[PDB]
Design a protein around this ligand. Structure first.
Ligand SMILES: N[C@@]1(C(=O)O)CC2(CC2)[C@H]2[C@H](C(=O)O)[C@H]21
Ligand SMILES: N[C@@]1(C(=O)O)CC2(CC2)[C@H]2[C@H](C(=O)O)[C@H]21
Lengths: 438, 440
């Protein structure tokens, strides 16, 4: 219903879960604030810096055609029909965020040779190039995440664990990979529970007692969506049930997962893909205003939900995102590098196909998608923009078009509670014991 | 590359694995005779009789747009694009065969509200109408088949078994459903192996070796693709490894799965969905020759493969199917049943939308798929066409567009060479098997 359009010489398709998935009947629920709106603004911020970059396509302005997935694969696939209908013209696609939506969207995109780079889809399956030949990502596959989690249990001598998976490609294949890896380290799994898309608080108590039916297994491994980890922790709190949580990037270092069930979560070890905040995105997001951000068609709806106001009611104007603490979303960097990977690919494309000018020559009217994905997108290699220069971070894709298997490890501890970085994984597990009380 | 097109007032899409899958450079392999050609020819047969029928769509003609899936989802989806290029116009789609083919095709077909009826896709994944709101099938979900297979093990007190599943939505869900039914009947799994999309003869051996790592687990439960079962039977014969096979409809009673691996498979228990060879299909298929069947662009290739001749070298001419021992592929009836399910739904929709004529009126141009599926496809009830005398079977779909969980159980034995399938029993809301018919 709402289209996000930016004019430009070339148009970059975008796909973001602006809204949450709806209730039993509605396809779209409330605005997904952090992983939705903020990740969308990250693509818009990147496109602005690129359009100001004199070293990166100074003669070709990049546009955007950003669609909302509503956190549901079938809705994203109904929306992704815009990207194919013409064949405005869509050069590539940034997104989606959730694996299921990327799989579904990739199967349609390959039929029209549309390149796609995801900034958050981690499911290992997307690494298979015979089925997903137009798919690249700035994120590593979950082969490497599940391997890393198996080493955490191997290190802390945890050999009788349990597993919790969100239904879908991410949770199932993620736990499946974890099965192989725990097996390979003498770790035996007591039981394996699966969480339905939209369970009730009664259903999660079912899962708690299901995990409890083996009291000896006090450790639980999770390949879960954040809502699921939060409802399961809430259910654990209500049922006065104490588990040792070992969780994937779904939970990550999200305050919203543990908020209200901080006691039930204390002791937990979580994983986030290795990222850093970008300060120029921070000041850009906090200076965003509903009367100046008309280019984002969902920014007013976010503003009404963020501040409990209405533009009809005239009570939105006194608020600012600067009064608020800015908790920059974890995968913001990966959105930023994914837009840059596509822009560099196209800069390299233009350099070779239009040597005589900075403008778009007939050799890129239209842009050959196959040549773009195979010869340029896959062969990008540049410094991550805005990177913490003290550490050398580089943007490229391996033989399977995946990002680098590097993860940060955290712990939820204690009045007051907080996630603390305790280690990392980058080919090997590396963590210091001095940062854990147990 | 080829597309079987025929004129009609309404056009029904078709999807069959006319060709097996190829290698890395090719997307299409040799001709698939049984699950390809006979299945394609069954739809043409049904179309031909529907168009002669004075009681079923007398004034409305049915055309077709039959595509080749090449036993591969990505190729099928490239092809299925034809069905949605109107936005010739496609009213409904008959197909595909492979469950991963039918899933991919449905995700697209629902976008343009096009009803889909599969004659072979058994994945339980396809029973969920939130996700597959325009899909229906003349076959049951694998929820019942997995229940059927654990009942067979529980009956023979095989408490320690191994599993093998073809990667994808048929193998993985089938076996997972099976393993839960096995657990609940105290049947423990020793090991579980996966058969990938691009398997090598060495990789197939690695699967056999993994199965032998548990020497007590002599039972091997498979939810595999046809080709995946044959190659596992080939790898086991190469290794003189002996397993009791219990296998899903993928294997079924296919002679092509056991060819060259007759001793490796002896004593195998195989499942097929309960069906009957249909009456007039044998006359039709056997009366097919290459100088009349120009309407099937893959038929000449089937002819060459069948008789090991060449039209370019003119050896083929002196041949006819009316001398061969006609083996009617087990799902022929479900293909014919799907074609007739769509025909009846449209006949009934036409009664509702065009009451003053036999011809396709404007209230039905184009056919509204949402109304066709929900108000007419899901509600169809009719006597199964071409049903043999002693049979009184009815074609219908349940609340979730599913067929009924009915299956025949067979066993593979050496009688007089001369190896064959023998029906030992059936499954229909409980197990019934004749222990007297199994040699072992
Ligand atoms: N890595 C994810 C995926 O779907 O592939 C798992 C997740 C569901 C929890 C979403 C995370 C995110 O948006 O930060 C993606
Ligand atoms: N029932 C099937 C399915 O895909 O759901 C299993 C199979 C893969 C082996 C193919 C069989 C067939 O075409 O008769 C279908």
């Amino acid at each position: 219903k709402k289209v996000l359009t930016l004019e430009g010489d070339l148009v970059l398709g975008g796909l973001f879960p602006v809204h949450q998935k709806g209730g039993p009947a509605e396809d779209c629920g409330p605005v997904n604030e952090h992983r939705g709106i903020q990740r969308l603004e990250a693509m818009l911020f990147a496109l602005d810096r690129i359009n100001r970059d004199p070293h990166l396509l100074p003669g070709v302005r990049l546009g955007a055609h950003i669609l909302d997935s509503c956190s549901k694969d079938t809705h994203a696939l109904e929306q992704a029909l815009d990207f194919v209908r013409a064949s405005t013209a869509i050069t590539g696609v940034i997104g989606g965020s959730y694996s299921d939506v990327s799989i579904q969207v990739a199967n349609l995109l390959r039929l029209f040779q549309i390149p796609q780079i995801s900034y958050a889809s981690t499911s290992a399956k997307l690494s298979d190039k015979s089925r997903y030949d137009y798919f690249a990502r700035t994120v590593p596959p979950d082969f490497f995440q599940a391997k890393a989690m198996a080493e955490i249990l191997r290190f802390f001598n945890w050999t009788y664990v349990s597993t919790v998976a969100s239904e879908g490609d991410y949770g199932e294949t993620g736990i499946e990979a974890f099965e192989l890896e725990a097996r390979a380290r003498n770790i035996s799994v007591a039981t394996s529970e699966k969480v339905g898309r939209a369970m009730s608080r009664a259903a999660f108590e079912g899962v708690v007692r299901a995990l409890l039916q083996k009291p000896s297994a006090r450790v639980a491994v999770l390949f879960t969506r954040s809502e699921d980890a939060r409802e399961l922790l809430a259910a654990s709190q209500r049922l006065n049930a104490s588990f040792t949580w070992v969780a994937s990037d779904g939970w990550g270092a999200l305050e919203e997962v543990v908020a209200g069930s901080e006691g039930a979560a204390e002791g937990a070890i979580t994983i986030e893909l290795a990222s850093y905040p970008i300060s120029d995105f921070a000041s850009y997001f906090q200076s965003l205003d509903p009367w100046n951000n008309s280019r984002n068609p969902w920014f007013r709806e976010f503003w009404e939900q963020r501040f409990r106001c209405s533009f009809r009611q005239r009570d939105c104007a006194a608020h600012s995102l600067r009064a608020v603490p800015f908790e920059q979303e974890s995968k913001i960097m990966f959105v930023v590098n994914a837009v840059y990977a596509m822009a560099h690919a196209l800069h390299n494309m233009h350099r070779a196909l239009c040597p005589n000018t900075t403008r778009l020559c007939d050799a890129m009217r239209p842009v050959n998608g196959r040549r773009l994905y195979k010869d340029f997108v896959l062969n990008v290699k540049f410094d991550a923009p805005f990177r913490p220069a003290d550490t050398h971070n580089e943007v490229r894709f391996d033989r399977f078009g995946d990002g680098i298997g590097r993860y940060n490890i955290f712990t939820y501890l204690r009045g007051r509670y907080r996630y603390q970085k305790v280690g990392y994984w980058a080919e090997g597990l590396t963590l210091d014991t001095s940062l854990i009380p147990w």
